[PDB]
Design a binder for these strands. Structure first.
Ligand SMILES: [Mg+2]
Ligand SMILES: [Mg+2]
Ligand SMILES: [Mg+2]
Ligand SMILES: [Mg+2]
Ligand SMILES: [Mg+2]
Ligand SMILES: [Mg+2]
Ligand SMILES: [Mg+2]
Ligand SMILES: [Mg+2]
Ligand SMILES: [Mg+2]
Ligand SMILES: [Mg+2]
Ligand SMILES: [Mg+2]
Ligand SMILES: [Mg+2]
Ligand SMILES: [Mg+2]
Ligand SMILES: [Mg+2]
Ligand SMILES: [Mg+2]
Ligand SMILES: [Mg+2]
Ligand SMILES: [Mg+2]
Ligand SMILES: [Mg+2]
Ligand SMILES: [Mg+2]
Ligand SMILES: [Mg+2]
Ligand SMILES: [Mg+2]
Ligand SMILES: [Mg+2]
Ligand SMILES: [Mg+2]
Ligand SMILES: [Mg+2]
Ligand SMILES: [Mg+2]
Ligand SMILES: [Mg+2]
Ligand SMILES: [Mg+2]
Ligand SMILES: [Mg+2]
Ligand SMILES: [Mg+2]
Ligand SMILES: [Mg+2]
Ligand SMILES: [Mg+2]
Ligand SMILES: [Mg+2]
Ligand SMILES: [Mg+2]
Ligand SMILES: [Mg+2]
Ligand SMILES: [Mg+2]
Ligand SMILES: [Mg+2]
Ligand SMILES: [Mg+2]
Ligand SMILES: [Mg+2]
Ligand SMILES: [Mg+2]
Ligand SMILES: [Mg+2]
Ligand SMILES: [Mg+2]
Ligand SMILES: [Mg+2]
Ligand SMILES: [Zn+2]
Lengths: 130, 136, 94, 37
RNA sequence: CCGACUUACCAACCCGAUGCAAACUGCGAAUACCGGAGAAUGUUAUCACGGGAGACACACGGCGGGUGCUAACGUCCGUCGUGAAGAGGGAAACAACCCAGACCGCCAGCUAAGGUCCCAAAGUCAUGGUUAAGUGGGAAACGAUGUGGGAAGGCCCAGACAGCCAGGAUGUUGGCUUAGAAGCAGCCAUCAUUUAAAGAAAGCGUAAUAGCUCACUGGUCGAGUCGGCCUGCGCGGAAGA
RNA sequence: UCCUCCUAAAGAGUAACGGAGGAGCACGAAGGUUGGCUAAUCCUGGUCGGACAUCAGGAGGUUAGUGCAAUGGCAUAAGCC
RNA sequence: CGAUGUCGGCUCAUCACAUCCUGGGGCUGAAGUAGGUCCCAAGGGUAUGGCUGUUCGCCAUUUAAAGUGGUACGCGAGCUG
């Protein structure tokens, strides 16, 4: 579908950054639907459907919604990447679940470089409000 | 096999097939098959085309045949000489001129009507084309 | 609004009409009201790609002849017997 | 190799080719569909 | 008796729309035919009478038709041209096709049909495109990513189209025929999660699924791409002593 | 042998073992004149009477009729007394 | 038609391919032998007897195969009747 729908999904992603927080990377070059029922069943464990893995990191798609929100994520653009925003519980445990899940039979996970709360890099952090 | 139930005379002349047609625009259904060439259609070719299109559309929808064989073509017997009178009427033929529509159809999707009329064209001798109804 | 640009027929007749039709054009007539009928020439492709819309025979047409606007409406049309082409269009000034 | 006049595509794995001025039809998964003009 | 009803069916009159007819015209040409006037031209080319014949076996081509197979260098009617009764040039040869009507002679010139590489006299003429089949230099229905174009249309630098990678999703042994029909057999039903998506599968593969896939769905990728239309020319179909 | 239409190419005419039909009569009235009149069909109502005899209206307008086969005509009637 | 001699048979052949065998190949619902269909290919070969005047055809028995047609339904100034 044309501009209306691409731009629609993108702006919808932008609205999820307006009330978002911590985020992380994930790149399942060889993923399975079985893992769909792990991180997303985890989404169901958090609250509901709202969480969007929205794997669409085209430099003119997901990165296109970048100049209006979190421009530091522009360097995350290259290769297969799926951004993971949050909403309930600031700096929640959704981040560590990528690192632990990757070691939990999932081949790979974009080298778990993470995204933006301290504007940092690949850092395994249990240092989250618990 | 279409055939008139009665006629004033049994045998007619040959005439010609010059000029264009009158029933060019689709006026009954939605899609139609329109001749492009010039020739003759018998009472058997039209029946075969109707059967083919009926099988193609699985008897669904409605069809109209706007042509009718009314010219009593005649043939003399085999191994006979010349003269001695005129031959005996054998079959009936409808004269076809370019622009004349042969079949019309309604209540059928266009993608199926195209192949339903292609099947009829593959059995009809003259070349035809697929047309749709238009607003005036 | 469907806008068309037209010419004026200097010569009429079967020969002139056939020359126009072979030169990727076609004649047309505009009549109605109380003024004199006008014989115009129109491009063939530019009208074949416009009449395919159902709005062409229901809405108004803005014809430009000699650098002026004329409001007409489709009243009659003649189509080629076995080709998707046009031969003549009769417009009513309205 | 069936030789006829009308050659066309029967399955989705058929490729129409022209060799030495002759039209041929070859399918990658059905030998029966091999046709020639 | 009278009937009350609907009903896998046919259908009169009329109305609305679409056609056809040599023996149907509420319509109606172009041509042709009768008569009058007028300028010009034609060796009165017109008519009447008288003397003398010859002939009444026609053919072909064009147009208009009947009978034939809308076959015949076939046959039968109307008009015109030619041969008959007409020589010459051209179509390689050719009574009828095209140009053109031989009083005679000339080793004079100008043209029409038709041609200008050689046979064989004339442009290896100029500009502009097409053809790659010797098409030209025998043919159809039909079929094809053959090319030379015209006008549009879809999708597309938030990434199209190909490839190149991951997944194509819970039941469901499906509502079922149940032998088994599991996503792909006839009914169906076609939800519902998870979604980034995905028919409670479009096919091969099947006992049937699995399986291998298809839409798909993400990732990669870096400019077009896909199909219809209108056409110029070309290929197959195309087998004989 | 004779008559009507088409083929018969809008003057006449024009062929085939061409396509469709008729004639070898009749009437002293079925002729002439004068005077008068207009149907075929359908609908409604009415005793025997029925789809259709006869009788009243209405619609219709020559879709009837011509002594005969067809064609061309016929209301001023060529039709009907 | 001021004559082009005719069916069949014997001898004698020749050309063609829409090929009967041999040759090569594709598909096969081609496991193999044996098969079915189609394309190319005419270099060579392509039967003896009973019946009938018969070509044709029926039957017996072979053959790798017992081809299709043209040559004035080949060939009587070669034969036969
Ligand atoms: Mg005619
Ligand atoms: Mg003209
Ligand atoms: Mg080769
Ligand atoms: Mg007529
Ligand atoms: Mg005169
Ligand atoms: Mg005589
Ligand atoms: Mg004579
Ligand atoms: Mg004659
Ligand atoms: Mg002759
Ligand atoms: Mg003729
Ligand atoms: Mg002839
Ligand atoms: Mg000749
Ligand atoms: Mg003769
Ligand atoms: Mg003579
Ligand atoms: Mg001459
Ligand atoms: Mg002369
Ligand atoms: Mg000559
Ligand atoms: Mg010649
Ligand atoms: Mg010569
Ligand atoms: Mg000269
Ligand atoms: Mg010249
Ligand atoms: Mg020379
Ligand atoms: Mg040159
Ligand atoms: Mg060809
Ligand atoms: Mg006449
Ligand atoms: Mg005349
Ligand atoms: Mg009388
Ligand atoms: Mg009177
Ligand atoms: Mg009564
Ligand atoms: Mg009569
Ligand atoms: Mg009288
Ligand atoms: Mg003789
Ligand atoms: Mg002699
Ligand atoms: Mg003799
Ligand atoms: Mg061969
Ligand atoms: Mg050889
Ligand atoms: Mg050799
Ligand atoms: Mg014996
Ligand atoms: Mg012989
Ligand atoms: Mg002999
Ligand atoms: Mg001899
Ligand atoms: Mg004897
Ligand atoms: Zn195949």
């Amino acid at each position: 579908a044309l501009n209306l729908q691409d731009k629609q999904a993108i702006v919808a992603e932008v609205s999820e950054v307006a009330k978002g927080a911590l985020s992380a990377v994930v790149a399942d070059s060889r993923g399975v639907t079985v893992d769909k029922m792990t991180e997303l069943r985890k989404a169901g464990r958090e609250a509901g459907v709202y969480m969007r893995v929205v794997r669409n990191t085209l430099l003119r798609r997901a990165v296109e919604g970048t100049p209006f929100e979190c421009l530091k994520d522009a360097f995350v653009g290259p290769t297969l990447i799926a951004y993971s925003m949050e909403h309930p519980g600031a700096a929640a445990r959704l981040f560590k679940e990528f690192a632990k899940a990757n070691a939990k039979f999932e081949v790979k996970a974009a080298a778990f470089e993470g995204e933006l709360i301290p504007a940092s890099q690949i850092d395994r952090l249990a240092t989250l409000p618990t | 096999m279409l055939q008139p139930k009665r006629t004033k005379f049994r045998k007619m002349h040959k005439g010609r097939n010059r000029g264009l047609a009158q029933g060019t625009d689709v006026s009954f259904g939605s899609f139609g098959l329109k001749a492009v060439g010039r020739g003759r259609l018998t009472a058997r070719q039209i029946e075969a085309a109707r059967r083919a299109m009926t099988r193609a559309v699985k008897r669904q929808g409605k069809i109209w045949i706007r042509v009718f064989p009314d010219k009593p073509i005649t043939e003399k017997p085999l191994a006979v000489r010349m003269g001695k009178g005129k031959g005996n009427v054998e079959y009936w033929v409808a004269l076809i001129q370019p622009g004349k529509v042969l079949y019309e159809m309604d209540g059928v999707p266009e993608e199926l009507a195209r192949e339903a009329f292609k099947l009829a064209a593959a059995k009809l001798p003259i070349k035809t084309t697929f047309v749709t109804k238009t607003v005036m | 609004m469907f806008t068309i640009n037209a010419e004026v027929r200097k010569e009429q007749g079967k020969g002139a009409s056939r020359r126009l039709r072979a030169a990727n054009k076609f004649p047309a007539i505009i009549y109605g009201g109380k003024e004199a009928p006008l014989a115009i020439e129109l491009d063939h492709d530019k009208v074949m790609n416009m009449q395919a819309k159902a709005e062409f025979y229901s809405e108004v047409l803005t014809i430009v002849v000699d650098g002026k606007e004329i409001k007409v409406k489709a009243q009659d049309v003649q189509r080629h017997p076995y080709k998707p082409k046009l031969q003549h269009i009769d417009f009513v000034r309205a | 190799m069936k030789v006829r006049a009308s050659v066309k595509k029967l399955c989705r794995n058929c490729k129409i080719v022209k060799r030495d001025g002759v039209i041929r039809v070859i399918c990658s998964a059905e030998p029966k569909h091999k046709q020639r003009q």
